[PDB]
Amino acid sequence: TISAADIEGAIEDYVSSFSADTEREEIGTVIDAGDGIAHVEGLPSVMTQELLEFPGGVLGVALNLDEHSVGAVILGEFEKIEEGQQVKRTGEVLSVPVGDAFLGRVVNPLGQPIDGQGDIAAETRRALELQAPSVVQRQSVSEPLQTGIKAIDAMTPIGRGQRQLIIGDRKTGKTAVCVDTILNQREAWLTGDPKQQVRCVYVAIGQKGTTIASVKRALEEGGAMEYTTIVAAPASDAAGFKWLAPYTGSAIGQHWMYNGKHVLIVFDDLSKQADAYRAISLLLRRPPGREAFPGDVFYLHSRLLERCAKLSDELGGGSMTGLPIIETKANDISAFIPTNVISITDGQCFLESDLFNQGVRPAINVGVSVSRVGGAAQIKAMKEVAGSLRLDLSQYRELEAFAAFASDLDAASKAQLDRGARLVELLKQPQYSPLAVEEQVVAIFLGTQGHLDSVPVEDVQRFESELLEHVKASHSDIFDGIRETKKLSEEAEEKLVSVINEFKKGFQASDGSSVV
Amino acid sequence: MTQELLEFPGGVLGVALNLDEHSVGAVILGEFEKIEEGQQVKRTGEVLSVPVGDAFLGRVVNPLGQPIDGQGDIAAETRRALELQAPSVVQRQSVSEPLQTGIKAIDAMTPIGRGQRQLIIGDRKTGKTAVCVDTILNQREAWLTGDPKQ
Amino acid sequence: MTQELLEFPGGVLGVALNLDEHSVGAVILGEFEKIEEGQQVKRTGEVLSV
Amino acid sequence: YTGSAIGQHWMYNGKHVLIVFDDLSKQADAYRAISLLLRRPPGREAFPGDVFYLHSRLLERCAKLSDELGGGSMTGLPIIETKANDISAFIPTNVISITDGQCFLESDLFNQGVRPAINVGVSVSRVGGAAQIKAMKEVAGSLRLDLSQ
Amino acid sequence: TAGRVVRITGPVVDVEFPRGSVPELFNALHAEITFGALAKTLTLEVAQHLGDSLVRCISMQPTDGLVRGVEVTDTGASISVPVGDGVKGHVFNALGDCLDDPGYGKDFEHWSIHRKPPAFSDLEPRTEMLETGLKVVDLLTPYVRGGKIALFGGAGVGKTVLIQEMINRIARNFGGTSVFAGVGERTREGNDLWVELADANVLKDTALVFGQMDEPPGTRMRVALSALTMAEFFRDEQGQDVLLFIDNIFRFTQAGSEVSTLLGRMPSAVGYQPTLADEMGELQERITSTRGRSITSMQAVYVPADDYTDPAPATTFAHLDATTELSRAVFSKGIFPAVDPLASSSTI
Amino acid sequence: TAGRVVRITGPVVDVEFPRGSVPELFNALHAEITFGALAKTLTLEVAQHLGDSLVRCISMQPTDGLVRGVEVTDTGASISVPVGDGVKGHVFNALGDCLDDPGYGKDFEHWSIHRKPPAFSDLEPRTEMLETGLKVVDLLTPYVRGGKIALFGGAGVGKTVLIQEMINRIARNFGGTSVFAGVGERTREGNDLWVELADANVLKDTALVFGQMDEPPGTRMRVALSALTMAEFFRDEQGQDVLLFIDNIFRFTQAGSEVSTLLGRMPSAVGYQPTLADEMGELQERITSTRGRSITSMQAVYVPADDYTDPAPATTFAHLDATTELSRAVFSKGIFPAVDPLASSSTILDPAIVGDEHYRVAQEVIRILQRYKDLQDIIAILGIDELSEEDKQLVNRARRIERFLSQNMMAAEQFTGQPGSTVPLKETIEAFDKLTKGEFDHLPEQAFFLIGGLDDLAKKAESL
Amino acid sequence: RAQASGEVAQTLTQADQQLSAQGDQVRSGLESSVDGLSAKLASRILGVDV
Amino acid sequence: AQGAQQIQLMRQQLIRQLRTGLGAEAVNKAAEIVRAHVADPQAQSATVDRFLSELEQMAPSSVVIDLRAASRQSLAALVEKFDSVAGGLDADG
Amino acid sequence: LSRIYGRPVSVQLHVDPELLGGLSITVGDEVIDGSIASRLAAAQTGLP
C-alpha cells in the first residue's frame, strides 16, 4: 500500500495547507447577453486586455471599451449568461503555460489537455504577443536542413531559419509532405548532440477529427513522437480557437528558441483562420474592404509570420523554419490571400493537379516554382554534382510541345528528349519512402552521367533500387567518404563507375535484354 | 391584423404591410394625389377578399374585382380570402390524362396532361403569345360537347 | 450668401458650399494647418470673382 | 393572387379550369421596388431573399385532386422572358428549379425555317408517356433518337 | 409568466417577459389564433437576446391575423420530438404530428432536437470496407463504411429504382432500418413516393420525413436536425445499421441565407452566411461511425449556373468521399446501372 | 495643462483637454504605461479636432496595456529628428535613436519632418544622360541624371536582385554620399545588405534606416518622411550630389488606407483613402534636383494582385519619367532579366539627344517585336506551316533578338556561380545592328541564351 | 511481431487485474485518517481550530 | 514500454477514484459539519467578531471620485447660481 | 469603515438567509465578503 500511503500523505499535506482570506476586489454585474457578446458594470478598476473567470468556468477578455459598459468576448458555453449575473476579472494578461513536458501531447489552443492521457505541468506563462528580435541581433543562413524528398532538395533547397511556402489545389498531399519531413527528422533526433537536434511542432486548423486520428496513428507507427508537439483546432469548435491557436504555437516555439534549440513549425492551413477573422470582424460592424476583407489581415498574418527567424550567434543562434500550407481554387495565383502570402514571404513551391492526374505523384512545376535561398543551403558535393537541372527541365518542357513533328528535330535533340524522359521518370517517388542524402546524391549523379540510357524506360526505377541495395550490400566506404569531406572524391568516382559497369553487365532488362 | 384593407376619407383604399411600436406603414393602390396630412383612417372589415361567382365569363374586370369593361355590373356568389392553405399530400392522385394543345411539336415531343405545371421560356419576339392563344382556343370542340367532363 | 467669398484671420479664403439650419460648411483654398477652433470669419459681401 | 383564387374556386367544385400567367418578371420587379421603398434591406441583385418564397406560394396552387373531393384539376402555364440567351440569372434559375418540364424557344430557328421554332435537344417532359395517347405513342416510334442522330 | 407581444413584422416577432422569467436560447413557446376562420396554433423559438427583457424570435408558421397583447406561454425546453418502436410505420413532418392521422400521440418518448457530436477520444481509428451486391459499383468506386457520397443524375435514369434496390438490399442483407428525409420536395412527388413505397412492400421498415415549400424556413432547417436525431436514436438504441437519405443541400443554404437576411445581419461572401462553415460542420459531425456501428449517408448537390467554384459547392465538397455520375447515352445503350466508369472516382 | 484618455479603439486614440490650452496640429504628446511587464512610454501626434476640446491622434507603438485617465503631456512642437555630419555609418529607427549604439546622438541639430516644396523659380529641367553596363537598359530606355526611376512589376519578379545589382554598379563607379531606405522589407535581407555593405567598405558614407512589417503603421508612413528630411538636409547645406534609394513604396499607400478605415471616413473606390492623390504628390514633389543640387532617385513599386486596373500605381504613373516594367510570362520563359520591351518607354529617347542610328535601331526592334506579338495569336494554334516564309523569317529574327537580350549580371554570383559581364554601348549597338542585318540566321537559337558578348557568342556557337 | 503483440496482450490482461487487486487494498485503506483531513479542512475554513 | 504507460494510466484511474472519493466525502461531511455544529445563533456573532478582526487588520485604501463635460459645467454653474440665489428663501417661499 | 475610507460610510442592511455565516459589505463597486458557502465552494473547486 505504498501508493495508498503516498496518496494519503499528499492529500493530508494539501488539505492541511489550504488557505483563503478576504480582500477588497471588484465584482461586475452582467447587463447584456447574446451572440457571445456581454456588457458588465461595477468595475472602476479597469485595465485593458485583462482576463475573466466566469462562474461557469468559461473565460473571456474585455477587449472593447467605452464610456458605458464595455463589450467583452466570451469563449466556450455562452448560453449560461444572464442579465444581472456577476463576473470576476483577473489582471493576468493572456499567456500560455510552457514546459518541456509538452512534447508527445495534444492539447487545446488554451492548453488544457485533450488526449485524456492525464495531466501536465508547466513552469512559466509567456504572453501571446511580445517584441520580435531586431535586425542587429540576427544572422545569416548557413545551415542545411535535410529533407526526405530528393526532388524538393534538388530543385529548391530549404534552410534553417528560412521560410518556405507551399501553394496547391485540393487533394495533392501536403499532409504527406509534412509527415515525410517529420519522419525524416527521426534520425536527427536519434543523435544526442544539441547542435544537430531539432524539435518539431505541428498545428492543424479547421481539420476533421478523422484526419487527426489518421495522422496521429501514422505518427505512432513511425515511432518518432519523442520530439513532436501537436496543436489541434477541430472544425466543429468556435472561431476563437481558430483565431488564437497559431499564436499559442508561436509562443511555445519562442520559449524554447530563447533557450537555444533548433525548431520547425508546420501550419496546416491559414485561409480558414482568415475566414474566421473576417466573420468575427463583420460581427463587430466594422466597415468592410475588398472582398469584404478588412485591411488588418495583412498586418495579422505578418505579425504571425516574421516571428520566425534565425537569431544572432551571441544570443544562441537558434533557428526555426516555418512551413505554412495554402490551398488555392482553380490554380490561380491571382487571388487576394495568395497575393498577400506570396508577397510577404520569399520562396515558394507550386503543386498542380495536372501532373498528379497524368500519373506522376510528386507534381512540382519547373518553370514558376522558385526559391531565393542561396547556395549555402546545398552541400558543396550537391552543388558540384547537380547543376543546370532547372534550365534543362524548362527547355524539355518547351521542346516537348513539338513532339508531333519529327521532320524538324532529325536526330539533333533525340538525346535531349531521351534524357528529359529518363530524368522525369527518375524524379517520381513512392509513398512513405524515407531516403537519405547519400543514396539520393548517388542517384542524381547516376542520372546526370546518363549511364542508364541503355536501360529501357519500363523498369529504370526498379533498376536503381537493385543497384542501390547492392551498393548497400557492397562496400559502403564511399558513402562515409563523401559524408565526411562532403565532396565527391575522384577515386570514389572511378570506383563507383566500375561497380556500376559490373552491376549493369550482370543486369537483365524486363524483357530479358542485357544492357551494353 | 396583417394585410388589413384600410379606409381613407377620399375614397381610395390601402393595405398595411409593416407595423411598429408606434407607426403603421401602408401601400396606396389607386390614385395618390388626394393623400395629405391630417386625414383620418378607419379600420374596416378584415383582410381583403374577392367575390367569386359564375357570371364572370366573357368579361374584363379589375384586379380588385370591378367591371372595368363597358358592360354592366357583375353579380356575386361568395367571398373568398386570397390567403388559404395549399392542398395536403393526402389529397392527390397520379396524373394520367391527354390534355391537348393543338400543336404538332408540343405533343410530339413533350406530352401535357392535367395537373402538371409546364413553363414556357423564351426570348423577345418569339411566339409565346400565339402558342398560348392557339392552345386556349383549341378547346372549342371540348366546350361544344354537352357534358362538362370535357 | 451661397458660394460667397469668406475671409479668415490667416489670410486664406473660403467658399460656402452648403448651408444648413445652424451650421455653414466652408473649404480652405491654400494652407489649412494653421486653422483652429474659435477663429473669426468675415463675409466680403461678394460672389467669387477673378 | 386574385386570378389564382378565382381559378381555385371553380377547381374545388369539380370544374376543370386552366390558368395562364402572362408575365412574372414584372411582378418580381414591382415586389422588389415596394420592398426597397418600404425601407427593407437589399440582397443579391438588390432582391429580397423571400421573393423565391413568393413564387413558392403562387405557382404551387394548381395540381390534381383525388376522387374524395370530386377529382378536380387545374394547370398553370407561366411565361418567362430572357435577354441575350442568359439562363444563369437569379429569377430564371429559381423558377426553373421550382418547376418540372421546360420549353426552350430559340430565336435563331425562328429567324429562318421553322415557325414554331421550338428546340428539341433542350425540351423535356417529366410526365412523359403517362400523358400520352396510346395510338399516338405507338405511331410515334421514338423519332427523338432518329432526329438526334 | 405569460409574455406580451410588442412589435411584429413578417415572420419576425418581438416579446417581453418579466424580470425573473427570461428564457434562454432555443426555447419553445405557444400562441393561439382567436379568428375562427383562421384558427391556428403557433410554435415559437428563441434565437436572440436584445435585452431589456425583450426577445426577438422566429415563428415556425406563417404570420397572419395576430393581435397585440396576446399572452405568450413557455413550453420550457427545446423542440420535443417523439421516438419509439412505432416510428417508421407511417409519415410525419418535423413537428412529430402524423399527417395521415392524428392517432399518433405522445406515448413515444420525447427527446430534444439539439445534440452534440461525439467526443474525440472515442472516435474509431481505422476504416472499414463496405461491400454491396452490385458488381460495377464495388469494382469501380469503393464505398467507405459510414462515409458520405455524392450522386449526379436526372429523371428517367433509374435513380429512384436504384434507391429502392439499395434500401431493400441493406434491409435484407445486413439488417437494420433506413429513413428518408425529403428536403425541398414537391407535394405531389412526395405522395407518389409514398404510394410507390406502399406498393413496393418495403414501407414498413422506413421512416419518411417531409418538408413543404409554403412553410417558413424554420421548419425547412429543422427537418434535417429532426431526421438526424431520429437516426442517432435508432443507431444508439437498436444497434441497427441505418441509412440516411438527403434530397438536396443548396436548399438548406438558401433557407439559411433567408433567415440571415430576415434577422437583418450584414450579408457577406456574395450574400452568404459568414458562419456557414460552423453550421455545416455542426450538421456533418454527426455522421461518422463509432462504437462499431456505421451511419452512412449520400447527398445530391445542385451546381448553380454550371460553376464548381462557388463557395457553397467548395465547402460541401470538403466532406466528400465518393462521387457517382449517371448519363443518358449509357442508358440508351441498354444497361441497368447506367453509370459511366470514366466520370467517377473514390478516395479509398 | 493635463490630458485624460476618454476612449480608445485600435491604434487610434481620442483625448480630451481643458479649455485653456489646446495644441495645434502635428504636435508630440507623451503618455506612459503603468503595467509591469509591458512598461513603455508612448507618443501621439495630432490628427484632427472633434470639438468640445476632443482630439483624435495616432500611435506608432502598439496600444495594448493602456488604461483610461492617464495624464497626457505635450511638447508644443512637431516631430524633430537629428541632423549632422556624423549621421552616416549608423542604423536608425523610426524615432531616430541609434540602434547599433544606444544613446548615440542627442547632440546634433534637430529639424522637423514637415517641410514645404521648393519654389517654382528654382526649378530646372535636366537631360544629363546616364549609362549602365547592362545592355538592355542602355539600348531601350537610357537613364537620365537628375530624374526619377520606376521599376514596375508584380510579386517575385526579381526586383530586389536588380536593385542590389544597380546599387553595386553605382557604388563601384561613383562615390559621394548615399542614402538607402525603404518600407516593406524583411529582416533577413536587411542583415544581408548590412553584411554586404560592410564587405564593400562603403558603409561609412551610406545612411541606413528602414521599417519592418511587425510595426504599427505610424512608423510605416513616417520613416519615409524622415528619410526624405535626411536627404534634403544633406542636399541643401552640403551642396553635394546624393544618391537616394527607396524600395516598395506601395506598402506606404496601403498603410494610409488602414488608418483611414479606422477613422470612420466614407470609403472610396476599392475601399481606399478619401484622398490619396494629394499626399502622393506631396511625397513625390519633395524630390527635386536644384540648379546647384543634382539629385538622382530610384523607386521600387509593387503592383497588387497582378492587376494594373488598380489606381494605386496608376496615380504614380503621372509622376515618373523613366520606367521599366516586368511581367510574369517573361520570367516563366526563362530569362531572368524579365523586362518587357513593348511596354517599357522613356521620355529621354529622341534623335535630338542621341544620334539617328540608335533611334533607327530602337524603332526597328520595336516594330519587329510588335509584328511578332501580332502574329502570336495565329501561330498559337496553326503555326508556321500555314504562314508564309516572308513571315517565317520575321518569326525567326524576332525569336533570336528576344533571346539575345538575356544577360548574366554579377549579382547572380550567389546562384549561378559565374562572373558577370559588361559591354560598352558602341559594341552593343554594333552587335544589335549586325543581328538585325540577319547575318546570324545560321546560328542556333540556344547559343544566344545567357551570353556575354559577340565574341563569347561566336565562341559558344562554334563550341557546339 | 504479431505473436509479440499477443504476448503483450496477455501482459496487459494480467496488469489490468493486478492493478485492480492493488486498488482493492487502496479502497480498504483510504478511510484510515480521512476524518482528520476533514477536520483540518474545517479548521482552516473557519479560520479557527475545529 | 507502452504497456508500462497503460499501467501508469490505470494508476491514474486509481488516482481519479481517489479524487472522486475525497471530493464526495469532503463536500458531504464538511457541509454537515458546518450546517450542524456551527449553526447555533451564539456562534454566528462570534464569526462576525472574527470578521470584524479582519476588517480592523486590513491596510488602508485610497478612494477618490465618490455626463457631458459641457453639460457638467452647465450643471455646476446652475448649482452655484442656486446656492448664491437661494439664501433669501423662507420656509414657505 | 471610516478608518479605511476618510469619508463617512452610511449603513443599509439587507438580510440574506442563504449565507451560512460571514458578512458582506459593498461600498460601491469594491466588495468585501466572508462566507461559509463561498469558501466551501473555493475549497471544493480547487480540490484537484
Curated annotation (Swiss-Prot), chain C:
Q: Which family does it belong to?
A: Belongs to the ATPase alpha/beta chains family.
Assembly mode: F-type ATPases have 2 components, CF(1) - the catalytic core - and CF(0) - the membrane proton channel. CF(1) has five subunits: alpha(3), beta(3), gamma(1), delta(1), epsilon(1). CF(0) has three main subunits: a(1), b(2) and c(9-12). The alpha and beta chains form an alternating ring which encloses part of the gamma chain. CF(1) is attached to CF(0) by a central stalk formed by the gamma and epsilon chains, while a peripheral stalk is formed by the delta and b chains.
The organism of origin for this protein = Mycolicibacterium smegmatis (strain ATCC 700084 / mc(2)155)
Within the intact protein, the region shown is 51 to 100 of 548
- Which protein is depicted? ATP synthase subunit alpha
Query: What is the documented function of this protein?
Result: Produces ATP from ADP in the presence of a proton gradient across the membrane. The alpha chain is a regulatory subunit.
Q: Which domain of life is it from?
A: Bacteria
Lineage of the native species?
Bacteria, Bacillati, Actinomycetota, Actinomycetes, Mycobacteriales
Q: Where in the cell is it found?
A: Cell membrane
UniProtKB/Swiss-Prot annotation, chain F:
EC number(s) recorded for this UniProt protein: 7.1.2.2
What keyword terms does UniProt attach to this protein?
Answer: ATP synthesis, ATP-binding, Cell membrane, CF(1), Hydrogen ion transport, Ion transport, Membrane, Nucleotide-binding, Translocase, Transport
Which residues participate in ATP binding?
Answer: 153-160
Topological category with respect to the lipid bilayer? Peripheral membrane protein
Where is the major localization of this protein? membrane
Query: Where found in the cell?
Result: Cell membrane
Q: Which reaction does it catalyse?
A: ATP + H2O + 4 H(+)(in) = ADP + phosphate + 5 H(+)(out)
GO CC, sorted alphabetically, is: plasma membrane; proton-transporting ATP synthase complex
**What Pfam families does UniProt report for this protein, alphabetically?**
ATP-synt_ab, ATP-synt_ab_N, ATP-synt_VA_C
- Give GO terms: molecular function aspect only: ATP binding; ATP hydrolysis activity; proton-transporting ATP synthase activity, rotational mechanism
- Enzyme kind, highest EC tier: translocase
Asked whether the keyword Nucleotide-binding is assigned, the reply is yes
Assembly, per entry: F-type ATPases have 2 components, CF(1) - the catalytic core - and CF(0) - the membrane proton channel. CF(1) has five subunits: alpha(3), beta(3), gamma(1), delta(1), epsilon(1). CF(0) has three main subunits: a(1), b(2) and c(9-12). The alpha and beta chains form an alternating ring which encloses part of the gamma chain. CF(1) is attached to CF(0) by a central stalk formed by the gamma and epsilon chains, while a peripheral stalk is formed by the delta and b chains.
- Stated family: Belongs to the ATPase alpha/beta chains family.
Q: What does this protein do?
A: Produces ATP from ADP in the presence of a proton gradient across the membrane. The catalytic sites are hosted primarily by the beta subunits.
| NCBIfam families membership | atpD
The name this protein carries in UniProt is ATP synthase subunit beta
Q: What species is given as this protein's source?
A: Mycolicibacterium smegmatis (strain ATCC 700084 / mc(2)155)
Curated annotation (Swiss-Prot), chain G:
Q: What does this protein do?
A: F(1)F(0) ATP synthase produces ATP from ADP in the presence of a proton or sodium gradient. F-type ATPases consist of two structural domains, F(1) containing the extramembraneous catalytic core and F(0) containing the membrane proton channel, linked together by a central stalk and a peripheral stalk. During catalysis, ATP synthesis in the catalytic domain of F(1) is coupled via a rotary mechanism of the central stalk subunits to proton translocation.
- For this entry, the protein name equals ATP synthase subunit b
Biased amino acid composition, Polar residues: 8-25
Disulfide bonds, paired cysteine numbers: none
**Keyword set for this entry?**
ATP synthesis, Cell membrane, CF(0), Hydrogen ion transport, Ion transport, Membrane, Transmembrane, Transmembrane helix, Transport
> What's the domain of life for this entry?
Bacteria
The portion of the full protein included here is 115 to 164 of 170
* Main location per the UniProt record: membrane
| GO molecular function annotations of the record | proton-transporting ATP synthase activity, rotational mechanism; proton-transporting ATPase activity, rotational mechanism
Region annotation (Disordered) maps to 7-33
Q: Which family does it belong to?
A: Belongs to the ATPase B chain family.
Compartments annotated for it: namely:
Cell membrane
One Gene Ontology cellular component term attached to this UniProt record is: proton-transporting ATP synthase complex
Swiss-Prot record, chain H:
Q: Which family does it belong to?
A: In the N-terminal section; belongs to the ATPase B chain family.
- Subunit text: F-type ATPases have 2 components, F(1) - the catalytic core - and F(0) - the membrane proton channel. F(1) has five subunits: alpha(3), beta(3), gamma(1), delta(1), epsilon(1). F(0) has three main subunits: a(1), b(2) and c(10-14). The alpha and beta chains form an alternating ring which encloses part of the gamma chain. F(1) is attached to F(0) by a central stalk formed by the gamma and epsilon chains, while a peripheral stalk is formed by the delta and b chains.
More details: Binds 2-aminothiazole antibiotics, which are antitubercular agents.
The name under which this protein is listed is ATP synthase subunit b-delta
Any GO molecular function: proton-transporting ATP synthase activity, rotational mechanism
Q: Which gene encodes it?
A: atpFH
Zinc keyword on record: no
The entry's keywords? ATP synthesis, Cell membrane, CF(0), Hydrogen ion transport, Ion transport, Membrane, Multifunctional enzyme, Transmembrane, Transmembrane helix, Transport
Q: Which domain of life is it from?
A: Bacteria
Q: Where in the cell is it found?
A: Cell membrane
What cellular-component terms does GO give this entry? Answer: plasma membrane; proton-transporting ATP synthase complex
